Amino acid sequence: TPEEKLLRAIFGEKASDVKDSSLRVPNGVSGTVIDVQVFTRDGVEKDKRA
Amino acid sequence: QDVVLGLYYMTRDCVNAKGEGMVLTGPKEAERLYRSGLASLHARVKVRIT
Amino acid sequence: KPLVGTGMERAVAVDSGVTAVAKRGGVVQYVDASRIVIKVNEDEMYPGEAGIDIYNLTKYTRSNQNTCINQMPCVSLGEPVERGDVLADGPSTDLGELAL
């Protein structure tokens, strides 16, 4: 919207073209993460953690 | 159910107990007697009431 | 354990697959909180390649309802065990008995 454009011009706020989606912990549950598994399809570049 | 049971117990009288036939000047001293352990919670007694 | 049971507790405990049960009775040679290694009795040793019996236990994995199913060793070093004895208690099991 215009006014937000005005704000971006004012402060010079480079808008990030990527939205957040991270899988955060459900509300009101607290415990220890005991294990992690990672499944990459064949072909894609395995990350270091995999 | 619990309430009614408590009242039933408290109000029921018994032929013979502690303080049979002693006369109290009012209810507040009745409570004095029961909480002081000088008479059973139910016992036939003559009290003045307004 | 239940203080007042009915006797079925052992039947159910063994029959459920969560307990670990002895196949050839013997002596507990090695016990660790992941595996039970049993030295077979010479009678029960297969003539060709009897060797010892190794039971790997299952540690906290997620059940269908999100409950934990963990097996703990019951017996101690050097204890003699017989065929059909209860090695490890599964979830909500004690010394072979059902303890809900």
Next chain:
Amino acid sequence: TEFLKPRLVDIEQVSSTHAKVTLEPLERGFGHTLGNALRRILLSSMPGCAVTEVEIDGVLHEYSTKEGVQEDILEILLNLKGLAVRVQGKDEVILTLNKSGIGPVTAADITHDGDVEIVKPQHVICHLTDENASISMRIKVQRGRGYVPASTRIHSEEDERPIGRLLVDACYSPVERIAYNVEAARVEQRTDLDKLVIEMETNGTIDPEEAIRRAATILAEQLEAFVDLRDVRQPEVKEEKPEFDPILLRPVDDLELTVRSANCLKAEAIHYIGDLVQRTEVELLKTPNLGKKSLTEIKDVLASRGLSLGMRLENW
């Protein structure tokens, strides 16, 4: 270790004889412990004076009737138990009532003795009819702790007394009724705290505040034998900063400075060069009639004594 001590001691005494007392915040469970102890002590063990026995000059037994009194003897017993008497010096005294004429014999008609004060002078006792209205009797007041009913004395009254001696329950404790409620209270972050509501009505003689007061007194006196931690302490340790610095002691005068300058530092609360040395520029500069000349003057003199401007030193 470090406990939580109660604050905000609020007391709403509707009808001075009736006192409601609210207290927070209290650690878990202490509501019932103290409510119960206090209740027990107040109720069962309180030194007081009360009517024990009375002798009627005209009738000999509690079941007979006196002519011209509509109230039966037991009725008078019940009325007189309510009489609140406070004796000062004597341990047991035997008062006599002798009254004539029509109407309700009231507490005011009691024989006026030295030590005894009747807290409720308007208590009716008996109703006397016309033209006869002659009553004389002896009411015995004795001191004791707690509550002792007549029935236990007459049970253990192997010391048989002459006829007419009507025994009465001795209600020494001045409190007629006492109760305590415990309810939820949170200290801004801790929710497991409690409020204590003590409702107490006494029989006039003693004021409620003092009732609670001496109840707690007795309990503290019982415990006193054990509690002994009564430690003392000091704020901090001595000084390691002697503010006697050998060059800074002498007075400003040694600077042989202009009058103007002097009068200005003086009027600026500067006495010894030990004050000046610890003086903010802005101050010396604002002093009216203190300009470049006067300021440079002060500065040059401080430089001559080997010192600088805006000097620093703590504790002076």
Next chain:
Amino acid sequence: EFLKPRLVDIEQVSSTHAKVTLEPLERGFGHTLGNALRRILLSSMPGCAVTEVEIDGVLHEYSTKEGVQEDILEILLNLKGLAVRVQGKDEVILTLNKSGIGPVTAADITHDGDVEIVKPQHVICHLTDENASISMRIKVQRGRGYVPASTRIHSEEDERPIGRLLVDACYSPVERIAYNVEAARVEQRTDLDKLVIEMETNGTIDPEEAIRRAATILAEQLEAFVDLRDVRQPEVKEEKPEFDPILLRPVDDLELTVRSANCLKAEAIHYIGDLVQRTEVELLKTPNLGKKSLTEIKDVLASRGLSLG
């Protein structure tokens, strides 16, 4: 006019079990003190207990060490049962390192001066391997009552080492308490009562200290009760006089310097009211009146709790 209880013989039948007797109790307070003392004893008695444990080769409560048979959780619970007595410090870090086959007893702990382990026979784990070795560091704090992990989470305070293994602190040494009132025949008296308090603890607190601590706490709260204010007061005044005395007083009453004096004078500033009402610019225009004078009048109205605005 009463008696008062004197602390008499304190029997130790076992290290854990103790009976404390009180002879000269007035009738009626037997139960009162029995109950109060029991309450305080069970509720608030300070004790020490393990607060946390750090073992190296374990990231979280649920993994398992080679060469041991207890699971990590059972080791924590057994440590929870560990009864330890520290004298001076509040937080001590004990170090346990043992190898080889055997049941790990409490005695194997690296023994520090201030620490007394009352029952070293308390088992912790069972080794099962020639080379199986455990090393751990137990942090023990003193506290009262019962504190679970979940509240302690607030006070993380850089728990950054993920190796930290938190256990709930059951800060309470007393396990069981009973009392009996029995007729206390003193050589010249009819009706006195004797209190017999039977107390069973984890074997850390001695009876006399416990009983004294309880009496202390009760004494503190009853002292708190002793005063009852009932006080009232009239103070509440009005807070806006005609013009506020600290605004009526005349400039003369301010006393500064002949210059500033004649300045206010010939400036028509006669009252500290008119004064506090005027701003800098006001005086800047007066001839021979400038920055320093005015600033002086300001530094003085500084201690006169009034500014210029």
